[PDB]
Amino acid sequence: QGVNCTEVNVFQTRAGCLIGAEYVNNSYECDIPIGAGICASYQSIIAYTMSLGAENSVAYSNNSIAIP
Amino acid sequence: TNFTISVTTEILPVSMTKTSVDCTMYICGDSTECSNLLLQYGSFCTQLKRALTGIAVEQDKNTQEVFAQVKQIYKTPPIKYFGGFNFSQILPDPSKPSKRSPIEDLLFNKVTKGLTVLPPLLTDEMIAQYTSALLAGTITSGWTFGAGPALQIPFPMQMAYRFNGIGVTQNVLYENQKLIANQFNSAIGKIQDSLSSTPSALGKLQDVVNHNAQALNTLVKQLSSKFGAISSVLNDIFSRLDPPEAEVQIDRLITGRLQSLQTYVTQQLIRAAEIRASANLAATKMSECVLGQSKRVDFCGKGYHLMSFPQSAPHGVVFLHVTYVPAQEKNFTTAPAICHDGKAHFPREGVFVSNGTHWFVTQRNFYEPQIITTDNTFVSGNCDVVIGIVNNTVYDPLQPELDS
Amino acid sequence: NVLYENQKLIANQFNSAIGKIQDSLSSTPSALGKLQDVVNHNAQALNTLVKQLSSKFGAISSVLNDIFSRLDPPEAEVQIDRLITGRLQSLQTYVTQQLIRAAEIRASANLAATKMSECVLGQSKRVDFCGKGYHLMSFPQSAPHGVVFLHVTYVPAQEKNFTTAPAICHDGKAHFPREGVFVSNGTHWFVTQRNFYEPQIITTDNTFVSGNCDVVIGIVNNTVYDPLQPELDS
Numbered sequence: 244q245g246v247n248c249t250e251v252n253v254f255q256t257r258a259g260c261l262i263g264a265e266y267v268n269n270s271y272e273c274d275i276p277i278g279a280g281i282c283a284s285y286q287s288i289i290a291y292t293m294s295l296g297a298e299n300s301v302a303y304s305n306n307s308i309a310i311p
Numbered sequence: 312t313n314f315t316i317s318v319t320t321e322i323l324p325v326s327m328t329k330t331s332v333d334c335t336m337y338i339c340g341d342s343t344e345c346s347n348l349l350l351q352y353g354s355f356c357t358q359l360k361r362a363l364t365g366i367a368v369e370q371d372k373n374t375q376e377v378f379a380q381v382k383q384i385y386k387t388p389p390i391k392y393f394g395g396f397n398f399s400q401i402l403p404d405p406s407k408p409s410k411r412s413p414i415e416d417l418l419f420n421k422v423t424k425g426l427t428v429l430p431p432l433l434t435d436e437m438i439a440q441y442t443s444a445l446l447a448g449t450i451t452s453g454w455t456f457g458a459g460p461a462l463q464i465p466f467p468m469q470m471a472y473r474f475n476g477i478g479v480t481q482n483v484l485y486e487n488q489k490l491i492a493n494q495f496n497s498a499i500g501k502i503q504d505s506l507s508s509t510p511s512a513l514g515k516l517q518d519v520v521n522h523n524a525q526a527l528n529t530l531v532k533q534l535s536s537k538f539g540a541i542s543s544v545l546n547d548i549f550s551r552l553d554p555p556e557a558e559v560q561i562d563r564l565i566t567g568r569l570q571s572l573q574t575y576v577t578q579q580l581i582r583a584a585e586i587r588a589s590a591n592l593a594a595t596k597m598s599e600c601v602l603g604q605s606k607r608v609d610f611c612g613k614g615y616h617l618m619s620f621p622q623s624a625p626h627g628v629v630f631l632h633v634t635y636v637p638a639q640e641k642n643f644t645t646a647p648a649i650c651h652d653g654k655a656h657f658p659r660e661g662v663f664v665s666n667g668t669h670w671f672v673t674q675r676n677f678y679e680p681q682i683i684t685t686d687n688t689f690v691s692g693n694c695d696v697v698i699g700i701v702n703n704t705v706y707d708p709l710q711p712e713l714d715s
Numbered sequence: 716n717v718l719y720e721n722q723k724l725i726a727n728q729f730n731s732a733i734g735k736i737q738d739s740l741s742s743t744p745s746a747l748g749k750l751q752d753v754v755n756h757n758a759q760a761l762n763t764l765v766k767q768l769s770s771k772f773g774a775i776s777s778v779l780n781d782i783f784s785r786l787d788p789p790e791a792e793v794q795i796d797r798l799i800t801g802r803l804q805s806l807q808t809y810v811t812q813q814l815i816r817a818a819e820i821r822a823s824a825n826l827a828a829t830k831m832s833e834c835v836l837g838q839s840k841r842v843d844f845c846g847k848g849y850h851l852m853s854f855p856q857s858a859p860h861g862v863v864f865l866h867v868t869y870v871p872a873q874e875k876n877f878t879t880a881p882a883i884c885h886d887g888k889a890h891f892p893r894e895g896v897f898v899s900n901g902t903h904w905f906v907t908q909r910n911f912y913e914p915q916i917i918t919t920d921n922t923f924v925s926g927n928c929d930v931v932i933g934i935v936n937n938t939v940y941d942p943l944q945p946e947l948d949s
């Protein structure tokens with residue numbers, strides 16, 4: 244936490260570098276929170292950006308309605 | 312006879328900066344003998360570490376439950392047209408690389424050893440994205456996204472539903488839609504100028520930050536306290552005094568530091584409980600004021616509540632309460648009932664209104680005089696039971712159908 | 716009316732949901748995780764209180780009888796005083812922690828009391844206060860050092876696209892729905908509620924007239940059915 248490992252699978256984050264876990268570009272649901280926009284999870288252990296949710300862009304119109 | 316659209320701001324804190332306290336090197340430093348003597352004090356540092364981790368995860372849970380209210384991220388449509396209404400102040404600016412609204416950017420700009428500042432799980436970026444998704448859901452789907460799946464609705468339809476929820480008919484919406492849009496834009500600009508020109512509008516978050524900083528500074532300064540010892544430096548006592556007593560001096564210094572740490576932990580726990588209560592209140596306001604229309608008075612702003620726009624704040628949340636304020640009252644004459652052929656007529660949803668000569672019916676929240684007919688009135692009882700009944704006739708819409 | 720239309724379907728859906736969530740409660744230990752964490756905190760407090768008796772507090776022994784029978788009384792009084800004040804500080808720390816936990820538990824109990832006053836003894840119109848979606852009702856249950864409410868909620872599904880209009884201009888007059896909304900399937904306009912699809916013929920019983928149709932924006936032209944003319948034709 245806050246200790247830069249350049250003067251001590253390496254991924255440098257804002258809180259600190261993570262050793263032993265590889266960074267993945269793809270984003271999934273987090274399991275073990277870490278902080279500073281990153282967290283680790285087990286699937287080997289990997290780290291990825293948080294998945295806020297499924298993207299759903301609703302079509303908006305001033306004359307269209309949706310009735311359940 | 313007139314209405315005013317007013318925008319009010321409510322600031323509620325969410326959490327604080329997460330702090331981790333290392334007992335061993337703060338109380339005794341790098342001295343091995345002091346650490347060995349501290350090992351005979353029990354599990355005080357372990358208990359404090361457990362309490363601090365519990366406070367940190369409590370703050371994380373509060374931040375998750377106040378911001379991540381929906382599991383679906385909604386994106387604004389490419390066309391930013393809502394019948395003349397303006398929302399660029401609350402929508403994120405694509406020009407800014409931070410993906411934050413100008414109101415959010417101004418709000419962020421207006422807010423400024425053994426202790427490690429643990430960063431929060433949710434930083435500014437995904438909190439701003441959550442607020443943008445919630446704004447898109449409440450500007451496109453209304454309150455339906457908070458009630459299950461997203462049900463698209465036009466903005467005038469949502470506004471008409473919201474004013475129908477507070478007992479105002481939708482006829483006045485179509486007659487003065489441009490007036491409503493202009494009043495909303497003027498109120499948004501006025502509240503933006505007011506928040507830009509008022510440094511004291513962020514008093515709660517600034518006070519919380521100042522209290523945390525003062526607590527950290529006080530804990531730092533307690534290391535220089537002698538606590539009745541010969542000196543405040545452990546190494547000076549070790550290299551200048553006999554051990555037989557020097558161990559008593561070390562014990563006195565470490566129990567003074569432990570008492571100061573206990574005071575800090577109690578203060579942090581009290582502050583965390585207060586902030587948890589404030590975050591529960593903020594979550595209730597997010598669930599009620601923003602995700603729907605609340606009929607509660609004074610809960611979501613002054614007067615009748617229409618909607619609330621959430622914005623991202625540093626260690627807090629700011630609600631843009633847009634409300635309905637009646638204005639320009641006019642004197643009028645009432646009547647308990649209308650006596651027609653020995654029958655008493657009462658309004659179904661409005662009240663009898665008179666300007667001095669004729670008698671009409673109008674809503675409680677707006678002056679909309681209509682002809683007194685049998686469709687909007689019901690008959691229950693005769694005229695001698697009520698007190699102060701006036702004499703007037705009731706127009707029958709069915710009568711001209713068979714008159715000719 | 717839709718409740719009486721498909722009452723058997725509603726009952727079957729409710730029974731299936733109740734059975735599914737009853738099966739899911741056994742396989743999900745995270746539901747009672749808050750109560751388990753409270754019990755674990757209680758056990759941790761007891762363990763800390765037990766372990767505090769093993770602390771020497773800078774002395775030579777953790778037993779005061781050993782100090783009394785082992786060390787000279789003129790300074791054994793000071794040693795016993797030091798042990799007394801150390802254990803007193805530990806007890807004060809435990810008391811403050813218990814008081815903070817009591818404040819948190821009292822706040823949670825007040826919140827639960829408010830929830831059972833709102834959406835157990837009656838129907839609450841609050842959105843997502845005690846259940847996701849349009850909350851219908853809740854079923855209170857008893858738990859060890861906790862309370863579980865089986866919240867039943869109304870969730871709309873199977874949305875359909877439709878074309879809507881602010882009003883209907885008929886005979887130079889604008890007609891607004893009293894409680895529903897005007898929808899169009901492509902050729903005809905119908906009125907239905909905002910939470911279900913029940914199309915109906917545009918009739919003056921559920922619509923009111925307020926002004927003409929040249930002041931509104933986005934209106935369409937359609938006739939309005941009134942049964943008075945067919946009643947008076949024959």
Ligand SMILES: *[C@@H]1O[C@H](CO)[C@@H](O[C@@H]2O[C@H](CO)[C@@H](O)[C@H](O)[C@H]2NC(C)=O)[C@H](O)[C@H]1NC(C)=O
Nearest residue numbers: 312313314315316489490491493494497638639
């Ligand atoms: C109700 O108040 C609004 C303003 O609060 C009035 O709108 C103004 O109307 C005058 C003339 O009609 C214009 O010169 C102003 O520019 C309008 N103000 C705004 C902010 O647009 C409105 O006329 C009032 N209605 C009644 C019936 O008195």
Ligand SMILES: *[C@@H]1O[C@H](CO)[C@@H](O[C@@H]2O[C@H](CO)[C@@H](O)[C@H](O)[C@H]2NC(C)=O)[C@H](O)[C@H]1NC(C)=O
Nearest residue numbers: 391392393395396397398399400413496499500
């Ligand atoms: C909505 O409000 C924004 C901000 O007030 C308007 O943007 C301004 O537009 C004028 C001229 O159109 C410029 O002189 C200002 O510099 C703009 N301000 C900012 C902050 O960009 C915008 O025109 C309004 N209307 C719409 C439809 O967006």
Ligand SMILES: *[C@@H]1O[C@H](CO)[C@@H](O[C@@H]2O[C@H](CO)[C@@H](O)[C@H](O)[C@H]2NC(C)=O)[C@H](O)[C@H]1NC(C)=O
Nearest residue numbers: 643644664665666667668669670671680681682
């Ligand atoms: C009270 O309101 C009624 C309705 O507007 C007024 O009656 C109209 O008054 C105007 C001008 O005085 C006349 O041109 C209309 O012919 C009247 N209508 C009818 C049906 O007769 C009435 O004058 C108002 N009373 C006061 C004291 O202002």
Ligand SMILES: *[C@@H]1O[C@H](CO)[C@@H](O[C@@H]2O[C@H](CO)[C@@H](O)[C@H](O)[C@H]2NC(C)=O)[C@H](O)[C@H]1NC(C)=O
Nearest residue numbers: 650651652653654693694695696700701702703
């Ligand atoms: C309003 O109408 C009522 C009923 O037509 C009037 O009440 C009558 O008053 C007279 C004398 O005041 C009595 O002899 C009748 O017995 C009353 N009838 C009833 C049904 O009460 C009343 O006077 C009228 N008010 C005004 C101001 O003209």
Ligand SMILES: *[C@@H]1O[C@H](CO)[C@@H](O[C@@H]2O[C@H](CO)[C@@H](O)[C@H](O)[C@H]2NC(C)=O)[C@H](O)[C@H]1NC(C)=O
Nearest residue numbers: 898899900901902903904905913914915916917
């Ligand atoms: C919209 O709905 C209406 C009523 O549900 C449809 O009108 C009916 O269409 C069927 C199909 O041919 C006819 O058999 C009926 O006689 C029609 N009823 C009336 C009262 O005209 C209409 O076709 C639907 N429109 C679309 C585009 O599906």
Ligand SMILES: *[C@@H]1O[C@H](CO)[C@@H](O[C@@H]2O[C@H](CO)[C@@H](O)[C@H](O)[C@H]2NC(C)=O)[C@H](O)[C@H]1NC(C)=O
Nearest residue numbers: 883884885886887888927928929934935936937
């Ligand atoms: C909807 O109905 C209105 C009124 O029936 C139409 O307005 C008239 O349109 C005709 C020709 O389109 C003109 O000659 C009249 O002068 C209009 N009257 C008024 C009061 O505006 C309107 O055009 C209709 N809309 C559509 C799309 O046909």
Ligand SMILES: *[C@@H]1O[C@H](CO)[C@@H](O)[C@H](O)[C@H]1NC(C)=O
Nearest residue numbers: 247248249250255256257259
């Ligand atoms: C750690 O140090 C390296 C070089 O010493 C530097 O490039 C890097 O930015 C540092 N990491 C952080 C988070 O500052």
Ligand SMILES: *[C@@H]1O[C@H](CO)[C@@H](O)[C@H](O)[C@H]1NC(C)=O
Nearest residue numbers: 305306392393394395932933
């Ligand atoms: C409604 O949308 C149409 C485009 O589909 C546009 O031409 C029209 O101007 C819009 N009306 C309002 C009041 O924004």
Ligand SMILES: *[C@@H]1O[C@H](CO)[C@@H](O)[C@H](O)[C@H]1NC(C)=O
Nearest residue numbers: 301302309873874875876877
């Ligand atoms: C309604 O239409 C829009 C675009 O026209 C589409 O995105 C949406 O999926 C449609 N709704 C349904 C239920 O298919």
